[PDB]
Design a protein around this ligand. Structure first.
Ligand SMILES: C[N+](C)(C)[C@@H](Cc1c[nH]c(=S)[nH]1)C(=O)O
Ligand SMILES: [Cl-]
Ligand SMILES: [Cl-]
Ligand SMILES: [Cl-]
Ligand SMILES: [Mg+2]
Ligand SMILES: [Mg+2]
Length: 426
């Protein structure tokens, strides 16, 4: 049996540093999705996200410690129901956490009274849960959807087997080579983008739902990006939003979220349904893309910064990151925001199930380095993949001036006239 905490007691503890309020619902509900039809979505202000889904992860206890949840803390759990928290509460006590309570009245008591403060990811509806995609493809009535034309796009890099081995029913595949050039690894020209989108069946008023499949990329392989399909999906989300597709969504966690939800997959090679006209000028959102001239200006500007989203070995010039990148080093003056272990993983921006990391954690880490929304930020990496996923996260927070410096280290280091640093920074 677990101690219950009351709505009155919890309100009195919202500012306490020894209390940890923990939301055990899905990360999508935490971000704002009204998964039970609640009028106010999101989480209790100050709450951390610890989906009960993660209880089967053998590294669950390390996830808790990585989140700085300590046995000395007073732990308060809540879900859609107090029964959601039963297994989480037991797990905490089994591991030395002795001050554990459950808040039974989150929904509808906390959600249904405007005096109880809540928080949410400001643009959460661009990061969709698997159930929303399911309702969309099934024709059901879904929230955050007022359109009549949609397309589910399975993204991959020169690896149609990632799609053919299993995809969301009805979805078509988009190779990333369709929207970015193998010469520069930058977005293609507007004329090419228009034709590529028309040929995949996408207009500017189509709701595009992008996802990819994670297939454990290996640095030994000639094309590790063929296994990092959901980064590629978010890369294509960047390019489509830059081009002018008004409603682009990303399935949170990619393909794993679809199968984790127990939904049926397909292996059909769905043929494309061309559309004659994209229906808008390209690019409609040029401010999302930054090129090297503007990137050099942003380095000299106080109002702006470049944000290096690469690994630490790349940052110190120990490796180039990719086998087509010649020079090792970093762009001087950029702010480091370590992506993860290498050029094809995003561990610092992702949970183990590949859903986006708790956005408050991304926010506080970014703020510790002066990465803040009042600036104009251009995220970049090797060629713009990882920078797109970083950019997308900031966009989801409603940050007003965030861009991707497309050329990245590849374009920067290809010009020997450009300066660069190496080694551990002094
Ligand atoms: C598809 N791509 C443009 C050829 C890149 C994408 C990428 C991911 N990480 C880095 S660096 N580049 C790759 O797969 O290396
Ligand atoms: Cl729903
Ligand atoms: Cl390969
Ligand atoms: Cl991925
Ligand atoms: Mg607290
Ligand atoms: Mg690029």
């Amino acid at each position: 049996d677990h101690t219950e905490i009351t709505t009155d007691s919890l309100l009195a503890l919202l500012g306490s540093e020894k209390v940890k309020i923990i939301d055990v619902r899905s990360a999508d509900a935490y971000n704002g999705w009204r998964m039970r039809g609640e009028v106010r979505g999101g989480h209790i202000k100050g709450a951390k996200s610890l989906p009960a889904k993660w209880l089967t992860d053998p590294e669950w206890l390390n996830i808790v410690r990585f989140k700085q949840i300590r046995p000395e803390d007073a732990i308060v759990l809540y879900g859609y129901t107090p029964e959601e928290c039963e297994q989480t509460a037991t797990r905490f006590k089994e591991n030395g956490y002795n001050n554990v309570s459950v808040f039974h009245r989150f929904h509808p008591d906390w959600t249904g009274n405007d005096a109880f403060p809540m928080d949410r990811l400001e643009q959460y509806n661009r990061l969709v849960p698997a159930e929303w995609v399911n309702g969309l493809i099934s024709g059901e009535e879904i929230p955050e959807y007022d359109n009549d034309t949609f397309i589910v796009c399975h993204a991959h890099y020169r690896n149609r087997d990632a799609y053919l081995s299993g995809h969301i029913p009805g979805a078509t595949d988009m190779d990333t080579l369709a929207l970015e050039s193998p010469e520069t690894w930058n977005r293609r020209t507007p004329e090419e983008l228009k034709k590529a989108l028309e040929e995949h069946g996408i207009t500017a008023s189509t709701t595009v739902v992008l996802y990819g499949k994670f297939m454990h990329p290996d640095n030994a392989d000639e094309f590790p990006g063929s296994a990092a399909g959901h980064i590629g999906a978010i890369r294509l989300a960047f390019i489509m939003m830059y081009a002018g597709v008004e409603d682009v969504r990303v399935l949170n966690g990619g393909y794993q979220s679809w199968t984790d939800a127990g939904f049926a997959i397909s292996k059909d090679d769905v043929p494309k349904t061309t559309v004659p006209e994209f229906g808008a000028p390209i690019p409609s959102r040029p401010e999302f893309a930054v090129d090297i001239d503007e990137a050099k200006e942003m380095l000299q500007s106080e109002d702006s910064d470049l944000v290096c989203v690469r690994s630490y070995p790349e940052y110190i010039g120990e490796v180039s990151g990719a086998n087509y990148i010649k020079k090792k080093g970093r762009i001087p003056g950029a702010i480091f925001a370590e992506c993860g272990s290498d050029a094809y993983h995003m561990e610092n921006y992702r949970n183990h199930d590949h859903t986006t990391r708790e956005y408050h954690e991304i926010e506080d880490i970014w703020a510790k380095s002066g990465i803040i929304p009042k600036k104009h930020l251009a995220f970049y990496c090797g060629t713009g993949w990882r920078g797109s996923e970083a950019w997308f996260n900031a966009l989801l927070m409603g940050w007003p001036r965030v861009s991707v410096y497309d050329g990245g280290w590849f374009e920067w280091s290809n010009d020997p006239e450009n300066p660069y640093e190496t080694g551990v920074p002094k």
